[PDB]
């Protein structure tokens, strides 16, 4: 019966491929050709947040577009004040192996995780005056590589055991666990409506999950290597996957296949962070080649290079108001571009 | 600056605190520890599901010893966390080819082309007893030589050392009897040799 199941799976995959290819009447390039070019985008380092003493592995802007939290393997998660470079908090992590960070939309909680297999939720607004752990969420069998807050109560974490789970910080138990990936789920990005999300895995696929029912609605493929980062389009109907094959593709949820690819001959390093702009026109994607290319999300051509880092950029984040983009590289310096 | 002056005071207080913690943590020496399962990883410094962090002090150095064998995932996705370790300690069970393949994979990784690998060959006496009854041809079909403990140990050591190609890294092979308490001294002297080599590199003279 295994042969019959394999044949049925192959037939279903062929049907999916035929359906996806049947709807591609016209590609994005020949439609966007009628739009004028965005022109060269020049950006200057307005701020530089010195203070970290090790490689920075995450950076998430607060919902107020002013508070930036950075996680580094020095054992600290410093919450910066981007307007005046000041440091608000310096949270000493339990363990020094941190690969992700998060900031609550309300600003009360800050998450953290890494090789510890534990996603810790810190309490910034404690009455005692200090920042203390509120719930050390545990239950994963691999490194937690990305965590995001749907709200102050429920968090979704992406692990390296082919599993993304939605926790409940109030009780500390996996409310819903999403499975179906083949390799490590190395990235995650919640939708603007927070009712669904995508997770780019090491198996060159970015599955579209659903938070409520815990079922993968759609799956996307087309990459030749692992997916290191992923982010929704501002509208929520599209997302961009930053692969490790020196390319990044813009998928469409309703169309259900890749729309444009952003590749350049002069680029060989792997992407580590892809983030859109407020209007979705720009795609400020970081690279391991020490730079951070800005791509026109429609014309699929470069519009500027944010070359100001002496090491590989491990994170990139555009604020909610769109007035600043911050890149944190391994040289311990997070620079706020504009 | 109405009360932002007080905010600057808090920023300077923790900025100095970060600097004080940074210099204190710089004295520690980090040693990534690898090897096959049940290969003697916990019987080298015996005298003194996530990651396992072991720290001990010897001759005014804080040796931090991470045993990352507890991660049941792909090495490549978290091996860049240990990019800046002083050295890699490798434990090989001589009483049992998987270790050789793992050594080949880890000794030529793009992030470990400049980090030397300290190699430990554990179970020397058990290996000798096994050789006295069973030959090395079983584990190494290409072995052609005398059936003696010393020759077989030298052959295995040469095979392990032959898997590197970067001339900027060195393998400090050493054999333990699973009972000697002096392995800490061997780790210390290998680490200090690596440190002076790195210092010579940093002075533009190595």
């Amino acid at each position: 019966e295994l042969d019959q199941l394999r044949q049925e799976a192959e037939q279903l995959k062929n049907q999916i491929r035929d359906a996806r290819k049947a709807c591609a009447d016209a590609t994005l390039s020949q439609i966007t050709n009628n739009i004028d070019p965005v022109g060269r985008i020049q950006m200057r380092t307005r701020r530089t947040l010195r203070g970290h003493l090790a490689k920075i592995y995450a950076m998430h802007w607060g919902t107020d577009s002013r508070l930036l939290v950075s996680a580094s393997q020095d054992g600290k998660l410093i919450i910066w004040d981007s307007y005046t470079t000041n440091k608000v908090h310096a949270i000493p992590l339990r363990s020094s192996w941190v690969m992700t960070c998060a900031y609550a939309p309300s600003g009360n909680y800050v998450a953290c995780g890494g090789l510890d297999n534990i996603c810790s939720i810190y309490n910034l607004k404690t009455r005692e005056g200090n920042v203390r752990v509120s719930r050390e969420l545990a239950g994963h069998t691999g490194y937690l590589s990305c965590c995001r807050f749907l709200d102050d109560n429920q968090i979704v974490t992406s692990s390296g055991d082919t599993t993304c789970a939605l926790w409940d910080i109030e009780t500390g138990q996996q409310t819903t666990t999403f499975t179906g990936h083949t390799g490590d789920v190395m990235s995650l990005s919640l939708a603007p409506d927070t009712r669904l999300f995508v997770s780019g895995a090491c198996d060159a696929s970015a599955k579209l999950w659903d938070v409520r029912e815990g079922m993968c609605r759609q799956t996307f493929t087309g990459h030749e290597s692992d997916i290191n980062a992923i982010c929704f389009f501002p509208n929520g109907n599209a997302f961009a996957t930053g692969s490790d094959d020196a390319t990044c593709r813009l998928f469409d949820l309703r169309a259900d296949q890749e729309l444009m690819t952003y590749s350049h001959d002069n680029i060989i390093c792997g992407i580590t962070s892809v983030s859109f702009s407020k209007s979705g026109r720009l795609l400020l994607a970081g690279y391991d080649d020490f730079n951070c290319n800005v791509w026109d999300a429609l014309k699929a051509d470069r519009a500027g290079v944010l070359a100001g880092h002496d090491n590989r950029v491990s994170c990139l984040g555009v604020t909610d108001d769109g007035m600043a983009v911050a890149t944190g590289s391994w040289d311990s310096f997070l620079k706020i571009w504009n | 600056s109405a009360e932002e002056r007080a905010a600057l005071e808090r920023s300077k207080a923790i900025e100095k605190n970060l600097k004080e913690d940074g210099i204190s943590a710089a004295k520690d020496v980090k040693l990534l520890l690898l090897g096959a399962d049940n290969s003697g990883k916990s019987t080298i410094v015996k005298q003194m599901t996530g990651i396992v962090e072991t720290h001990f002090t010897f001759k005014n150095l804080h040796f931090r010893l991470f045993d990352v064998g507890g991660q049941r995932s792909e090495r490549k996705k978290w091996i860049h966390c240990f990019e800046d370790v002083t050295a890699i300690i490798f434990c090989v069970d001589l009483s049992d080819h998987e270790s050789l393949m793992l050594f080949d994979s880890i000794c030529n990784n793009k992030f470990f082309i400049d980090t030397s690998i300290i190699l430990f060959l554990n179970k020397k006496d058990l290996f000798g007893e096994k050789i006295k009854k069973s030959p090395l041809t079983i584990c190494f079909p290409e072995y052609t030589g005398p059936n003696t403990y010393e020759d077989a140990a030298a052959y295995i050591q040469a095979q392990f050392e032959s898997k590197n190609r970067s001339p900027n890294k060195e393998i400090y092979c050493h054999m333990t009897c699973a009972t000697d308490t002096n392995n800490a001294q061997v780790i210390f002297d290998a680490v200090t040799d690596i440190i002076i080599a790195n210092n010579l590199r940093g002075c533009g003279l190595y």
Partner: single-chain antibody
Amino acid sequence: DVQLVESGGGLVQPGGSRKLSCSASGFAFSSFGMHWVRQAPEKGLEWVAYISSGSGTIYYADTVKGRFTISRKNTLFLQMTSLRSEDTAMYYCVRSIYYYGSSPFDFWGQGTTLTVSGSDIVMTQATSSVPVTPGESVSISCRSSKSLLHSNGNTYLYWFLQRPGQSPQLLIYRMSNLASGVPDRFSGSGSGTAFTLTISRLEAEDVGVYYCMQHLEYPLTFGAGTKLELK
């Protein structure tokens, strides 16, 4: 939970000395800049001293400088030398932490009574007594000689409610935000010079004295104190 208890009162002859100690427990006292606020028997609160985190800076009032000394095992000490006739007051130990989004003057100590035998920002409250009935709405006004709206957009007008026989509690901080633990009935407003604390559906537990404060520059000057008495 959080408590700031203290002692060191008693009758003091004029010209003597007395040590007032603030015992702090239940919070990270090492990162809090504790103030000192005194209250005359029949007058409003007046600022006395302030010591920051790590004792970086210490400030004293105009009529206190030199005579007193404030220093900080989780305990704050205030030295009193050359006491005058106007030093008869109840002294409150007030904590305050300063960063973006912080809540200065959030907690006030129990306080101990102690008796003996021009360019500052002066702030006045137009009304001193407003008799209102429960279930209605009341509004207390506060003015200032100099505009408190700083360049960075923050206006510094802290509002305090002092229930009879109880230490004051923070109600509105920075003239727009609401202190934690305060019912949503209270709401601040105003801009530049004129401030207003609007209370909607006033309850029987909202009676007391409301004090208007600024934090633009030391010394910090409280208001005259408006009393919202029942009926």
